[PDB]
């Protein structure tokens, strides 16, 4: 249970995702690649772009093969598109292996790359079902497992930033670990609790109960998972379905009511500040998500602090103060357990056993009074079904699955 070579192999800027160094081609071309458990394509910049210092140069790789097939991926924000191919891929601070993987060479994009994020591509770690153009394009991790003896599991320790902050002109640097093929016991303390992967597409899970400062939201538990709940390293925020979001904000507002913040703050569109080191953490409540256990009628809770859901942003004009962004936001596409959740925990994506593990992270930000927690079991006599069944479209139904 020791993977020293892979510890601290993640970097990034606060709110701009976590990336790992990868190489593509022969000889190896190094790129920084966003670690994304919310998608399933390995897609890299492969042409000049204003926000790229470098890109994958297929012509420089003796081992590159063109698959003679394009790929077009639109999404809420924008789109990326390009050409499918294969090449040799490695993770220098990962397992000592080289695999031939599918690579989408991004030739055109809109609102995909971010000025200053320092990443040039994305590593989709989710399952084939949500790969583009379709589920026949083998995702990277599937290729890695099939071609090597690497166990079918990876784990993520995402470590958040906190004041004092080093720089005023740039966003705070973040670090973390992606342990490929194993669990590193130095990265967590206490018990490691597992929730089932409901279905292998996204890393979909089931939330059975939500509490804000020990107070049950008392909603039909299907609301918590409408229309899905997923664990997504490629989302910064904790994102909650509309109804759940409104209930949560109401509760957090009430607990923090000694402070009257502008509406902009609760919408995540405006910072709030206190004098250096005087942030009244104790007025903000803890948030507990109870996740379905491996055992029928059991659940466990993961509990996060305001240190997780209030993101530090050092203002150039207000460098004397500690300023924060509210990082819980509304969703119309289900619960997203993003960096806000993951930064409290060491998270084990146990694909082999169709389960996700949570333990208290050795690097989570806390204070002397409260800690992020993973606690269980909680037993519920005749526990309800909290899963939502997404209405089946004719187009989806018409697909064959040979
Ligand atoms: C929600 N989500 C996405 O929209 C997506 C979809 C896709 C097509 C792979 O493209 C991107 C590109 C950048 C980011 C991005 C940009 C800035 C910060 C962070 C983070 N954390 C992530 C996220 C994504 N992947 C996920 N999981
Ligand atoms: Ni058929």
Swiss-Prot record:
GO terms for biological process: amyloid fibril formation; amyloid precursor protein catabolic process; amyloid-beta formation; amyloid-beta metabolic process; cellular response to amyloid-beta; cellular response to copper ion; cellular response to manganese ion; detection of mechanical stimulus involved in sensory perception of pain. The modification N6-acetyllysine is found at residues 69, 218, 222, 228, 242-243, 250. One of its GO terms (cellular component) is synaptic vesicle. It is a single-pass type I membrane protein. Glycans are attached at residues 96, 115, 166, 297. Expressed at high levels in the brain and pancreas. In the brain, expression is highest in the substantia nigra, locus coruleus and medulla oblongata. The active site is at 36, 232. One of its GO terms (molecular function) is enzyme binding. It is an enzyme of class 3 (hydrolase). This is Beta-secretase 1. The gene is BACE1.
């Amino acid at each position: 249970g020791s993977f020293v070579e892979m510890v601290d192999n993640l970097r990034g800027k606060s709110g701009q995702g976590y990336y790992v160094e990868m190489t593509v081609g022969s000889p190896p071309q190094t790129l920084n690649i966003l670690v994304d458990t919310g998608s399933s394509n390995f897609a890299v910049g492969a042409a000049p772009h204003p926000f790229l210092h470098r890109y994958y140069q297929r012509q420089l790789s003796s081992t590159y093969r063109d698959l003679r097939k394009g790929v077009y991926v639109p999404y809420t924000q924008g789109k990326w598109e390009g050409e499918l191919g294969t090449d040799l891929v490695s993770i220098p601070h990962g397992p000592n292996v080289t695999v031939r993987a599918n690579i989408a060479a991004i030739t055109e994009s809109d609102k995909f790359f971010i000025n200053g994020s320092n990443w040039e591509g994305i590593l989709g770690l989710a399952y084939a079902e949500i790969a583009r153009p379709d589920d026949s394009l083998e995702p990277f991790f599937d290729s890695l497992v099939k071609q090597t003896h690497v166990p079918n599991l990876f784990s993520l320790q995402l470590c958040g930033a906190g004041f004092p902050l080093n720089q005023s002109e740039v966003l705070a640097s973040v670090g973390g670990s992606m342990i490929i093929g194993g669990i590193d016991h130095s990265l967590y303390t206490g018990s490691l609790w597992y929730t089932p992967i409901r279905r292998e597409w996204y890393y979909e899970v089931i939330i059975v109960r939500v509490e804000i400062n020990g107070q049950d939201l008392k909603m039909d538990c299907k609301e918590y998972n409408y229309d899905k709940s997923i664990v997504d390293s490629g989302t910064t925020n904790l994102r909650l379905p509309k109804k759940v979001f409104e209930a949560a904000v109401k509760s957090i507002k009430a607990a923090s009511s000694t402070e009257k913040f502008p509406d902009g703050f609760w919408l995540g569109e405006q910072l709030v500040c206190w004098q250096a080191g005087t942030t009244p953490w104790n007025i903000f409540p803890v948030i507990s998500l109870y996740l379905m256990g491996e055992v029928t009628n059991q659940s466990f809770r993961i509990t996060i602090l305001p240190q997780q859901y209030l993101r530090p942003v050092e203002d150039v004009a207000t460098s004397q103060d500690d300023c924060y962004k509210f990082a819980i936001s509304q969703s119309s596409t289900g619960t997203v357990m993003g960096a806000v959740i993951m930064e409290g925990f060491y998270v084990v994506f146990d694909r082999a056993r169709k389960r996700i593990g949570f333990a208290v992270s050795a690097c989570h930000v806390h204070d002397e009074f409260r800690t992020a927690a993973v606690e269980g079991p909680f037993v519920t006599l005749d526990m309800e079904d909290c899963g939502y069944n997404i209405p089946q479209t004719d187009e989806s139904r018409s697909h064959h699955h040979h």
